[PDB]
Amino acid sequence: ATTLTVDCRATLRGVTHCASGSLYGVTESKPFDINQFVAPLKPNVFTNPALAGFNHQQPIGAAIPTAGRLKNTTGKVMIRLADIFPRWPYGFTNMNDWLGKVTSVINQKKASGYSNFYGYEIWNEPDGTFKNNNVSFNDMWLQTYKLIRRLDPNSQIIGPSYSYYNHYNMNAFLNFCRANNCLPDVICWHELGGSQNISGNIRDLKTLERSLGIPERKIAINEYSDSNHYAEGQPGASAPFIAKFERNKVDSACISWWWTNAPGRLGSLMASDTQKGAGWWFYKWYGDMTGNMVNVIPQNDNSNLADGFACVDSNAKYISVLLGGVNDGTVNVNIKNIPAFIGSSATVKVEKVDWNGKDTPVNGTNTVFSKRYTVSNGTINVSIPGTNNTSGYRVYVSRL
């Protein structure tokens, strides 16, 4: 069996659904039915291009109208300023042109009156996309940072949004930022190579901040996926990402956008523009979580093996554990330090959502079992039989 231990004593923080969001997962058009497909997820942060159209990175996804469509949901919009420019890597022009366009965006953002902006992302993957531009990335960052501070001082500034976490890049950047009083409010990079290095990378960043005497910043992982782009929005592949983001108290994380012909599917949570996929149902369970997140001890934090995230709600009186990822065909979920409100006997409902493919409609979830468990030594040991690497699972515990 692959084993997870849920420690109800180890309170992390209030539920934030920190990893429920996507890059170009909501646009001006898609999903068409916000109340049906977006609101129930209780999403956190979406990343959207500052501008959209023929002069810009993509023809859809403009941040300001997207924020407007999300205003009745829990969702907030991070503005990707780099998407002002077309082509890959970005067709950066010059600092005069850039700062004028950023000024226009800041004016349009403030003028919209919408209050659900997460902040400004100065640049996207500068480790890969900002070379031979006649200005250094550091110099562009400082000048853009000063403009945003002048015109929108209460907004968050997010970066540097690297392709990959790298200690040496991040050290050079934070050293420059500390020297020039331009530290990001939210430190950000992408995890598009799988989940196996998240915990190490976050540890590395926190150790680096302490090393430079930088007060600990909020973290955003504003693109995440397995290396296999077909596994974007897959419940099993997604669970270790969410688990690690929750374990490390990440401020926000957004699913990748690998399928550029299919914007507006919430990170491949939708199978089509009219139907839910497997991931939607798994993220719906995540959005249902209330109360406090509690620590889950993974099989192996430095792996893509099955991992989970858990909430304890003393008001509604339940425990919910969500999990998935690579396993040996059985998953054991040991729940310890169980609150007295559960009593000596619990109803344990185990449910799953199966995945065939990102574009396969899924119309609901399946019960694996609902059974009585006796609490022994504050512990329930749940064994989930016949598990696979792509399904998502929930263990829901309440008093008998």
Q: What is the DSSP string of 161-188?
A: EESS--HHHHHHHHHHHHHHT---SEEE
Inside any domain, residue 9: no
CA distance 147 to 152: 8
Q: Are residues 386 and 242 in the same domain?
A: no
Q: Are residues 373 and 280 in the same domain?
A: no
How is residue 109 annotated by DSSP?
Answer: H
HSE-CB for 163 with a 13 A CA cutoff:
8
Phi, psi of 268 (to 5 degrees): 60, 25
Residue with tokens 């890049």: 169
The amino acid present at 266, given as its one-letter code, is L
Phi, psi of 255 (to 5 degrees): -60, 145
Q: Are residues 370 and 244 in the same domain?
A: no
CA distance 172 to 203: 17
CA distance 46 to 267: 10
Q: Length of the chain, please? A: 400
Which CATH number characterizes residue 55's domain?
3.20.20.80
Query: Edge to edge, what strands does the sheet with 307-313 contain?
Result: 366-374, 345-353, 392-399, 318-324, 307-313, 292-297, 2-14, 331-336, 380-384
Inside any domain, residue 11: no
Q: Are residues 48 and 154 in the same domain?
A: yes
Q: Are residues 270 and 320 in the same domain?
A: no
Inside any domain, residue 181: yes
Q: Are residues 353 and 273 in the same domain?
A: no
Which CATH number characterizes residue 354's domain?
2.60.40.1180
Is residue 362 within 8 A of residue 392, CB to CB? The reply is: no
Cα Rg of the chain (Å, integer):
21
Is residue 338 within 8 A of residue 8, CB to CB? The reply is: yes
Q: Are residues 313 and 268 in the same domain?
A: no
What kind and span of H or E run contains 243? helix 235-247
Inside any domain, residue 311: yes
Inside any domain, residue 63: yes
Q: Which residues contact 7 (CB under 8 A, 6 or more apart)?
A: 294, 295, 296, 297, 336, 337
Is residue 21 within 8 A of residue 75, CB to CB? The reply is: yes
**SS3 assignment, position 23:** strand
Is residue 120 within 8 A of residue 157, CB to CB? The reply is: yes
Expressed as residue numbers, the domain containing 149 is 16-288
Resolution of the solved structure (Å)? 1.5
**43: cis peptide before it, omega within 30°?**
no
Q: Are residues 90 and 223 in the same domain?
A: yes
245 alpha-carbon distance from chain centroid = 7
Output the CA–CA distances (angstroms, integers) from residue 270 to 28, 154, 316, 392, in the order listed.
16, 34, 29, 15
Inside any domain, residue 37: yes
Domain edge (last residue) among 236, 255, 288? 288
Inside any domain, residue 169: yes
| Strand ranges, E, within the chain | 2-14, 45-49, 76-80, 117-121, 157-162, 186-189, 218-224, 252-255, 292-297, 307-313, 318-324, 331-336, 345-353, 366-374, 380-384, 392-399
Q: Are residues 300 and 274 in the same domain?
A: no
Domain edge (last residue) among 239, 257, 288? 288
Nearest CA to 306 among 396, 392, 199, 369?
392
Roughly how many angstroms between the first and final C-alpha of the chain, as a whole number?
27
CA distance 382 to 396: 11
What kind and span of H or E run contains 247? helix 235-247
The total number of structural domains in the chain stands at 2
Q: Are residues 276 and 334 in the same domain?
A: no
Inside any domain, residue 80: yes
Q: Are residues 300 and 391 in the same domain?
A: yes
Domain edge (last residue) among 288, 312, 335? 288
Nearest CA to 239 among 217, 228, 224, 221?
224
Two tokens, residue 136: 């250094």
Sign of CA dihedral 392, 370, 288, 16: negative
Q: Are residues 263 and 298 in the same domain?
A: no
CB atoms within 10 A of CB 132: 6
